[PDB]
């Protein structure tokens, strides 16, 4: 039996992908949002009560609980909760999420499990959201998702005017690394998709998707890291616990200007933040952005509390001359909506933790298991279920499958080896197939393609 | 997302087609009873379920109303075929719809006379319909709460209820057959004493058997089955955490108060008139008739021949405050009456404390004003549907006082009504028989799911 | 501030003594029947007022409750004394309290047989008591509304009501005397047709004056007097500003709907049975009996001899939805039923659109949730007082069905109840006669003013 | 016919004293406060809706309807409010409130021309301050009210240590002005009343009550002004629109220290207020008062929004050494309860205007007409009604009247002349008699004493 805790924004996503596979899921939110959300959710039940008192825990604690995921908004309370669980009840393997971050600096003995935390693994919002550094570090990188275990990774890169990808034909990209076996899934240009056969990469908005083994993907990304001139300036409009620590992490390597609306918070930042020019104003007014070289800024990161303020300020910095625009979206309906040409990348803090931690763990298998992103596109990881010829798709060849429109098979994971998809190969039983939709309203049609005749 | 429901209707009447085989098998075992219609209906309904079975929108609010309205209407029209085809009870299409709906809608109303000399297949399928709609009641009303009237799983309780609902019909059929009953009649009468239906294989209902013991057993399992099944869940999970978890529930307390008060007033009145020669008999017949009619079961052991007319009128009026909320049958459940009392008490308590904050507390918890507003929207809908049904029966030429009794018998899902009706709906006007079918449909779904369909704002 | 009330009590009964002199003068004028008790009672009442007035004291919510309860009870006892003394109606103390309270509490119930051959003083003073308690009703219910379901001058309307209440009884006694009524019987019957009382100087109620015109006049001034007097104030203030300000008030619309519906259903039912040979008779008797009983007046023109048994029961049940909220004489007022309907409709409309803000709008304005909570606290207190009254009458050996009718006749302030206690309350059990007096008191006080006093938390 | 307008900080109180006219009274406040509060605590009429739309105004009548009271917080709205009534509805007697005060500055030339729209009569709620200034002068003058159309005035003075009243026996005070005919009503000492004839005034905070003709009061108060050394130190604990304008009015003649809790308001004051040392701190903490010579301040004025803060801070400044303490009480229940000895004077903005206006208002002659003060004391102006013997009190002498305990008649007004009612009380009296109660719960008995035998 698996239990999760807290009202934290992430727990809901941890309560959607994990469902099934012979494990009964329980969520114990805290009182208000937790009651609604708890009521709202598919499958497993929710008891409303503080996540640290033992009485609410006793339902989980001794009745053959599988894994304790204690993810809460507040850290200091979560630690006390994890210890109350361990010392009162067995709770053999537990998880705790603390955005201390100070505690993360010193695991010490408490994270050694003698006292205070008695936890196997700790998940932190801040360092996992510091993958934004990986995004700024790798120029022109919009997204990366992973499939199967760690073997294959899809990547969405952007070709900037003056970059190395503009003008070069796709055949030159394929010939520049003759030892790299990659497969271009699709190319979105001005919002509309394009069929890639050895085309010329238009500078303004081409988005190129790679599907290959992680070793090869990390190698093409390192080569593009070497070729593309690195970013020099960076601008941030949020004073929060994420914005502050991002300014701290970046100030040594880049020239950072940060913006805040709260005078006292701005003062506290200017004290804490050295080498970072900290301002006091709304992220909306142009009279500050233009006055602050908005035409020359490279990356504009929006980390406001409100999503709509992020989206609008960053779309305005994109119009004014910023090269790359990033926002912090806490509403999946928004991230599925604005991460297009105008906004290069939106970072849902829930999916930033979920994708990385969930992908390694358990390699969840379902006829259709999707990785959620933006666009009308979607990237799913179909599993070939059914007997050798009983199933619509098992035993046949990729060129012979009646795939939905826009759907392109990228790679095939066979156990421990990765093969780049081709019409010459034949699908086998229990084979992981990595696919790519251009219009995601055909997600069910692929499920029907892989759903055999019911037994 | 209208018009994608047909897949569920087909999948539903396919299950209902599968249910037809068991009464047919009982027909084969006895070998008498003209069971050909049962297999015929099995084929016709399985074919109808296949005819309209195209999956469109499956998955891993305004539609659910049109789901449950068809879960009762469609399934009633499907169950009206065995009576239409068979010959021994040769009954009109209208009488067939009536008997099928009443069997399935748990209302004890009947239109066939001569139940004793009837095919054991048909009058088994009648009690099985009662048992089926019995499950349907608790599976709907507990697991669909747009109209309700620390929190476990939907399916695990959807089957814990089924397990209680089966350990009860078993524990009751056993005691029935132990009290000197045919195992056939024992099953047929536990199907109807647990579902709180009111059906029997005999023209005398529970008067055919003349044993004090069967009367006491029916009283006991009627009180048990009218009780909130969610509260029995506490008696099932992990076993006997308390045996007096019941008395903590103030709905149970109000239910026992009502049953005891109505019992002893009916008993004292049954003695002021010397209606029975032996006080042990007045006690027996009073306890059984109160527990039967107050709990909206519908069983009768006497014809009220010597009974003063006040007692039948009082029992009919008491049929309004029926079974608990989490159980079969009932009109306005006992909890809505406890709420009415509590709100009257609150307005009283405001006598000297105008500025005090009083809140409707039920078992320690407070009730949101939306729920408490819904309970009285329900009282208003009940009254303004009752009056329209009564005026409809009267308009068709039905006797007026008899119309008022038939309405209070069907809307409450009782369903024996005093007057010209008790007890066969045979000579009822045909149009009034359809208006009765509409009323008994109103009784299930708590008068709102169906009333909404008539509203213009819905469409 | 208990014991500061005695001054008001003394003033009230002193005024009552002056009122007593007026009937006594009528007694002397007609030259028949015992005016000596009237004069003796005047002296006793004035003496009690001075013995109790003593010297007034300091001027100063619970006090108001005590004032109104004392007002009704004390004046009823005062009325009881005159009957107690006289000889021509030689009646027990209980029958005297009954007749006095019923005359004053507007409930048309009577316990004296042989009204025709009675002293014109006594059966005048009876109608005058009805007229007096009529003023008491509208002056309280319109001018004493704190927890008694724009504010203008208190006294100017306290007397504008009296001016309407007299401009009505004048025009009605006049129309009676133009209809051939005796000027005595015309005054005595306007005292009771405007006060919505139900009293007459004849044993046959309005049967003795068997005129179509008298019946139509009674119907008209019963509808007028059943209308909210605050709404007549709009027809009086600054002359005839509108005559159709009425139709805007949705309580009036619901009242006309109820009266028309109940009328034509009683008329069509009175024709399905061919109960009357001439439709001009069925129309008359239906319209008069509906308008009399539904509006809680209590007049009767027929014995229900040829009437189908449904119709008297329907009239008795309709006596619950009595007059308007400001009008004289009522059970649960029609506006509480319009609120019930509106809330049912609201909940229906709020089931289709769940996340919507709907509010009970009456005539354009929204209602505070406290008033709407009070209307249902009143429904609950009404029901749980009805049941206790019925069980009390039954306990004293009264017939059960008759008990339910006597209760619905007194608590509604009707007050002729069908059945054993049909035309006369004289042979009613004595304890049941006291419980009846208590019930009609409950019904006059809107079920709350008296119920509050029984609570221990009050004192 | 009387109307007043919503919502009214003071207007509600203007709605309680003014209802004594036989002609019809109406009060319409702004919304619920006027109606709900108004209906519950008030007597005959009203009204609804926001101001100043014309739809609410016609309810006043305005068909030669005599009284219009435009109680308003903001002036700009009030002028338009009274104008809509005159033009659309033509109400004849019009009155207005302006705290502009630039308009209050120029209205004597603008409003006394007839061109001005509709409000020649004026009433400012901020000219109560002048009364505080009079209190700061005439040291030891707790209160004065005037009866019989300002003919007779009762005054409550306080005797301070070092003053001219200490040690001197009441006979010496009587001999210091042999041309003044005054009447010592009562003397409160440590809260208990005392028989005053021929007693030595105890220095510690004695309260002495004079009753005399207005000429005599205006002469003895000026004489006490001449003897007692005037006040030089004043401390204020309120930044309010009243406190600010009082600091403005006082700063030129006295050394003013002002206290505020809101820093931005303190800054705005220090900008506006010159010659006034403006502080920033709570009026409660001693650590500021002692540090700021609280033991040496002469007058401590409390003009906070909250009454309880005034009362407590001023009782603390009284304990610490302030000579005279004044507060701003917005609840008559408080002024009747706390203000004796511990708090010298509270300025009810309701009673400050009411006391003067009711005196100027006709006719105020009822069996009992009460002007009320602080404490259980009372000052009434009873009217002797009835023929030579029909009343208990007409024609007889005060020494023979059975007056309630502690009740002392101070003066008797006939026409234009006033008598001090010494001994026999030779009298004409149909005519107005001025009294003084020590316990006001005996007010009704005096009404009973003056109420003739009812017909
Ligand atoms: N329009 C805006 N421009 C600049 N900063 C803003 C704007 N709106 C909000 N902020 C700031 O975002 C900062 C940090 O977000 P915060 O509220 O700390 O996030 P959380 O609620 O997760 O703690 C705050 O200082 C807040 O003032
Ligand atoms: N100790 C205190 N507690 C609360 N308020 C204080 C205190 N001392 C000074 N003040 C100030 O009193 C002022 C209120 O003045 P006033 O004009 O009545 O407020 P408003 O303008 O809201 O009416 C505010 O500046 C408030 O901060």
Author numbering:
A (entry chain G), D (entry chain H): 2 to 456
B (entry chain C), C (entry chain A): 2 to 61, 66 to 154, 174 to 483
Quote the passages of the study that discuss this structure, keeping the authors' original sentences:
TrkH, KtrB, and more distantly related KdpA belong to the superfamily of K+ transporters (SKTs) that are found in bacteria, fungi, and plants. TrkH or KtrB proteins assemble with their respective cytosolic partner proteins TrkA or KtrA to form a stable complex. To better understand the mechanism by which the Trk system functions, we determined the structures of TrkH-TrkA complex from V. parahaemalyticus in the presence of ADP (TrkHA-ADP), ATP (TrkHA-ATP), or ATPγS (TrkHA-ATPγS).
The TrkHA protein was crystallized in the presence of 10 mM ADP and the structure of TrkHA-ADP was solved by X-ray crystallography to a resolution of 3.53 Å (Rwork/Rfree = 0.25/0.29). TrkA forms a tetrameric ring, and each TrkA has a prominent non-protein density in the N2 domain in which we modeled as an ADP. Each TrkH protomer in the current TrkHA-ADP structure makes contact with the N1 and N2 domains of TrkA that we define as HN1 and HN2 interfaces. In the previous TrkHA-NADH structure, only the HN2 interface is resolved. TrkH remains a dimer and is in a closed conformation. In the TrkHA-ADP structure, each TrkH protomer makes contact with the TrkA ring in two places, the HN1 and HN2 interfaces. TrkH from the TrkHA-ADP is in a closed state, and the ion permeation pathway is constricted with a radius of 0.9 Å at the intramembrane loop immediately below the selectivity filter. ADP binds to the N2 domain and enables TrkA to form a tetrameric ring that holds TrkH shut by making contact with TrkH at both the HN1 and HN2 interfaces. These interactions, especially those at the HN1 interfaces, keep TrkH in a closed conformation. In the N2 domain, ATPγS and ADP interact with TrkA by an almost identical set of residues. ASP283 interacts with the adenosine ring, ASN306 and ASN24 interact with the α- and β-phosphate, respectively.
